[PDB]
Design a protein around this ligand. Structure first.
Ligand SMILES: [Zn+2]
Ligand SMILES: [Zn+2]
Ligand SMILES: [Zn+2]
Ligand SMILES: [Zn+2]
Lengths: 111, 290, 351
């Protein structure tokens, strides 16, 4: 980066996601002026972030254990996915943490 | 005996009167009517929290009556233990029941509910180095373990050992409560004495079954396949019996012939340790197997 | 604290004649457990209610019923003007159980085929009671939607507990763009009122379209009893009507003459229409402390007015919801009753 911050004078940084707004001055070693974040002023809820830590078995889940199978975790995720597929209208996404993870998971879901 | 009568003590707490019993002031504004002397819960249609009240009653007790207008309540010692293991707050549950139930909360019933909320299904049995010890996550469990004749007197002062927890776990206390808390190691002789004391002094401990800590038992020739049939009551019973993390030995009444042994097979595979199966008769054993 | 419609801003036009083709949904989805028996049983019950209501308030229209089972649209009642046939058809269905997936596309195409004979002055419509969260189409759908809007066929659908993008597009598309017709429900009572508001004719802001005089004639009841004889069902019926022109008997109905094919009505149907055309101004709720009016009802004689200074009670409100043009009071019950059942405003009639 250093050459551009050297060359240009007035630069901007913008994203719908940046956080925290101090790691970037640290890593990139550059001077800022206005490090502001904007709040979604909504007259309505409009979206429902959640943290589904425990499946039906009330068991803590993740991908952290391995890149592997542990049929408890697999069955838990599969239940999650299928009930969502029942409930949401057209259009849904998922984001597995890594490709091999998806390969194994879906293979043995099809199992 | 090594068992406590309270498990089968259900069938009491149904009797009252009108002179000593006063009209519940909440009777004027009470969506339900929890009859304490009779142990009943007359949850009429006026209750707006009827689902939650029924869930709480079924946890703590056995709802005998479920009429179209109002429900009924029955007392069950096993039901009391199940409610205690449910995990709901005792004081908050009592307050909610008093608010919804028009009848005032009875003294004896309130005391039983308070005892079941903490003591019932909430005993403390600490573990050190992945074994069974005399301690508790809560303060009461540690005091009981220290004052326990077998837990304390038979428990070595060493807080925890990995090898002692694996081998000796005052016997191998694989049926102890949650480990990794303030506790001390115990020997490998007399779990019979420990459970006898627990049932005699009425200590319902939230036991587990640390199968991976059963270092003495090699993992038997078990094929951990859940491909056998699974049923809603079967799976919910499995969820209840496995508890938290490690499984636990428990009692579940099941419809015989309706896949009763399926959950047992699943749990036996889950623990991956030495398990045996018993049916009624040897001919019935063969019939069930086939 | 009030929940009132501010103003009616199409009190000039409606579709008085109708041909509404209700299409139910009998598919595996409707078997879940959210409404008391199921989706399906409650749906059909309310459908019966709506059939009665709609054929009352619009007693000159027709109607046809369509199911969606196994991805197929199987007509269960020809487009007809006799409520009893449709009622019986629904009765029959309710004892039968759903299967397969809802094929919205097929139902749509079957309707568009079905409503072709309906003449220009008559107005078309469909009412999808869509219950599921998917469709299964054997063709392009936007093709069909385009054909629809080409054939001037408004569509209103009542989704169950979700919002489906394609349905929203569908309603927004046929109804001249103005999206208000994809209302979906959140409660059973909401559902009852949903059907109720589906009963009335449907204005938004009508484009200037062809308005056409329609020939019709009124019958005269018959007298004889033993001479029982019918020309619309070929039975013996102890006495009926006479087409003024065809001059043949016709069993009791607002039906179309089965001999010379002209519409038959008495007038009371036209009276219902009149009621729908030009309704009243919504009755105003009088100011709590500024009313100083008579302490009674007017149409009725109720004693529910006020309480005169009671800390919070009098501070609440003054039940004097009073209509505008006649400027006379009316208790809440009287106003509800006037604006629901009979639309001649009591005082506003009298002057
Ligand atoms: Zn006839
Ligand atoms: Zn005629
Ligand atoms: Zn009145
Ligand atoms: Zn008036």
């Amino acid at each position: 980066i250093k050459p551009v911050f050297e060359r240009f004078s007035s630069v901007i940084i913008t994203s719908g996601t940046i956080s925290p707004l101090d790691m970037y001055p640290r890593m990139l070693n550059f001077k800022t002026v206005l490090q502001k974040s904007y709040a979604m002023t909504l007259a309505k809820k409009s979206f429902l972030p959640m943290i589904i830590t425990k499946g039906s078995d009330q068991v803590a889940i993740s991908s952290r254990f391995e890149i592997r199978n542990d049929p408890s975790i697999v069955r838990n995720y599969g239940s999650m996915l299928v009930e969502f597929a029942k409930i949401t209208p057209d259009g849904m996404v998922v984001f597995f943490p890594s490709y091999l993870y998806m390969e194994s998971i879906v293979s043995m879901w099809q199992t | 005996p090594a068992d406590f009568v309270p498990d089968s003590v259900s069938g009491m707490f149904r009797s009252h009167d009108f002179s000593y019993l006063r009209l519940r002031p909440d009777h004027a504004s009470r969506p339900l009517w929890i009859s304490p002397s009779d142990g009943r819960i007359i949850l009429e249609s006026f209750s707006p929290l009827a689902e939650q009240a029924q869930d709480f009653l079924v946890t703590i007790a056995e709802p005998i009556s479920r009429p179209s207008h109002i429900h009924e309540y029955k007392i069950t010692a096993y039901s009391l233990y199940a409610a205690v293991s449910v995990g709901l707050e005792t004081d908050d549950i009592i307050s909610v029941l008093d608010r919804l139930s028009k009848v005032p909360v009875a003294e004896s019933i309130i005391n039983f509910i308070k005892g079941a909320t903490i003591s019932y299904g909430k005993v403390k049995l600490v573990i050190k180095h992945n074994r069974y010890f005399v301690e508790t996550t809560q303060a009461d469990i540690l005091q009981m373990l220290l004052n326990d004749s077998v837990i304390g007197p038979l428990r070595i002062d060493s807080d925890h050992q990995v090898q002692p927890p694996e081998d000796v776990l005052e016997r191998e206390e694989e049926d102890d409560d949650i480990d990794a808390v303030h506790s001390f190691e115990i020997a490998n002789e007399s779990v019979e004495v420990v459970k006898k004391r627990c049932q005699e002094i009425d200590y319902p401990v939230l036991e587990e079954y640390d199968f991976r800590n059963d270092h003495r038992n090699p993992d038997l020739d078990i094929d951990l396949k859940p491909s056998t049939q699974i049923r809603p009551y079967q799976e919910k019973s499995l969820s209840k019996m496995f508890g938290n993390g490690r499984a636990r030995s428990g009692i579940i009444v099941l419809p015989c012939g309706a896949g009763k042994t399926l959950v047992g097979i699943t749990a036996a595979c889950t623990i991956k340790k030495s398990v045996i199966v018993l049916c009624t008769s040897s001919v019935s054993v063969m019939q069930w197997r086939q | 604290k009030k929940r009132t419609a501010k103003k009616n801003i199409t009190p000039y036009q409606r579709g008085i004649i109708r041909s509404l083709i209700l299409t139910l949904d009998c598919s595996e989805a409707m078997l879940e457990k959210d409404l008391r028996p199921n989706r399906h049983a409650m749906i059909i019950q309310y459908a019966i209610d709506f059939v009665h209501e709609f054929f009352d308030q619009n007693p000159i229209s027709q109607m046809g019923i369509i199911i969606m089972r196994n991805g197929l649209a199987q007509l269960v009642s020809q487009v007809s003007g006799n409520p009893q046939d449709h009622i019986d058809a629904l009765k029959s269905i309710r004892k039968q159980e759903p299967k397969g997936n809802p094929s919205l596309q097929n139902a749509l195409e079957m309707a568009r085929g079905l409503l072709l004979p309906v003449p220009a002055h008559c107005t078309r419509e469909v009412l999808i009671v869509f219950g599921s969260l998917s469709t299964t189409d054997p063709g392009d759908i936007h093709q069909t939607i385009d054909s629809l809007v080409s054939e001037k066929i408004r569509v209103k659908v009542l989704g169950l507990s979700a919002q489906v993008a394609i349905c929203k597009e569908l309603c927004k598309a046929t109804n001249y763009g103005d999206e208000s017709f994809y209302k979906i429900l959140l409660d059973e009572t909401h559902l009852k009122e949903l059907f109720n508001e589906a009963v009335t004719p449907l204005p938004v802001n009508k484009i200037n379209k062809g308005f056409t005089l329609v020939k019709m004639g009124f019958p005269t009841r018959i007298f004889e009893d033993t001479p029982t004889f019918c020309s619309c069902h070929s039975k013996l019926v102890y006495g009926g009507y006479f087409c003024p022109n065809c001059h043949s008997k016709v069993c009791s109905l607002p039906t179309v003459c089965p001999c010379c094919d002209l519409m038959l009505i008495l007038s009371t149907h036209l009276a219902r229409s009149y009621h729908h055309l030009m309704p009243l101004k919504t009755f105003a709720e009088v100011p709590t402390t500024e009313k100083f009016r008579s302490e009674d009802c007017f149409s009725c004689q109720s004693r529910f007015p006020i309480l005169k200074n009671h800390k919070n009670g009098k501070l609440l409100t003054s039940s004097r919801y009073r209509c505008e043009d006649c400027k006379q009071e009316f208790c809440v019950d009287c106003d509800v009753f006037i604006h629901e059942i009979l639309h001649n405003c009591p005082g506003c009639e009298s002057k």
